Amino acid sequence: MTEYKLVVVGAGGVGKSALTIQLIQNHFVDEYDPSIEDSYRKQVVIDGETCLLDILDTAGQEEYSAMRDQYMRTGEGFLCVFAINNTKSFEDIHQYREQIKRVKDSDDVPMVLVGNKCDLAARTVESRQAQDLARSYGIPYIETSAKTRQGVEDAFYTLVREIRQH
Numbered sequence: 144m145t146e147y148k149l150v151v152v153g154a155g156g157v158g159k160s161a162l163t164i165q166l167i168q169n170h171f172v173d174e175y176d177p178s179i180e181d182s183y184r185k186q187v188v189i190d191g192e193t194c195l196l197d198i199l200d201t202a203g204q205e206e207y208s209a210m211r212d213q214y215m216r217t218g219e220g221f222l223c224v225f226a227i228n229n230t231k232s233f234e235d236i237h238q239y240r241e242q243i244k245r246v247k248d249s250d251d252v253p254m255v256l257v258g259n260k261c262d263l264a265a266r267t268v269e270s271r272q273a274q275d276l277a278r279s280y281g282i283p284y285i286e287t288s289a290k291t292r293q294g295v296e297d298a299f300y301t302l303v304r305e306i307r308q309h
């Protein structure tokens with residue numbers, strides 16, 4: 144089985160770990176022991192082919208920088224998560240990607256933007272802004288929610304597709 148290391152990036156309150164625990168543990172984060180494994184693992188079939196979906200979540204409310212590059216340098220694809228109610232996350236998506244390029248030493252690398260907390264109600268940045276954000280990079284966009292487990296699998300699965308090419 145192919146091993147895919149996906150580095151999940153997010154602002155802070157967006158809910159990066161939540162999407163991971165939901166896809167991997169089918170549960171909501173914010174109640175697990177951190178630094179236990181450092182990365183998540185999962186076996187699924189995307190695009191009709193069986194591959195290993197290793198979800199690697201990153202820090203959100205810790206201004207992680209030193210380790211931030213570590214995940215990228217060892218990770219293949221990068222899943223960006225933003226909050227519809229937290230416009231602050233919208234600006235985070237671009238600045239974060241810039242960090243991926245420096246470490247990845249490339250331009251077009253496996254990446255996927257996912258609008259977390261979309262099932263809430265208060266969406267500051269309409270889908271137009273989110274969709275246009277991903278288009279600016281040339282990556283697919285998928286709206287999902289770490290609270291309803293809607294699209295969580297899609298967003299994560301989509302990321303693998305880009306990595307498979309690498």
Ligand SMILES: Nc1nc2c(ncn2[C@@H]2O[C@H](COP(=O)(O)OP(=O)(O)NP(=O)(O)O)[C@@H](O)[C@H]2O)c(=O)[nH]1
Pocket residue numbers: 155156157158159160161172173174202203204259260261262263287288289290291
């Ligand atoms: N309504 C809603 N709330 C969400 C969603 N995703 C995350 N949250 C909210 O996000 C909060 C948890 O975020 P967070 O502070 O990053 O928790 P953590 O990631 O476990 N800790 P840390 O940030 O230190 O890693 C909770 O208040 C949770 O309810 C979502 O899709 N919908």
Ligand SMILES: O=C(NC[C@H]1CCCO1)c1cc2ccccc2cc1O
Pocket residue numbers: 180181182199213214215217
């Ligand atoms: O460097 C790491 N560990 C020491 C050995 C064993 C695995 C490969 O190197 C290691 C680095 C990581 C970097 C980013 C995310 C998860 C990681 C998880 C890891 O286990």
Ligand SMILES: [Mg+2]
Pocket residue numbers: 159160203
């Ligand atoms: Mg967390």
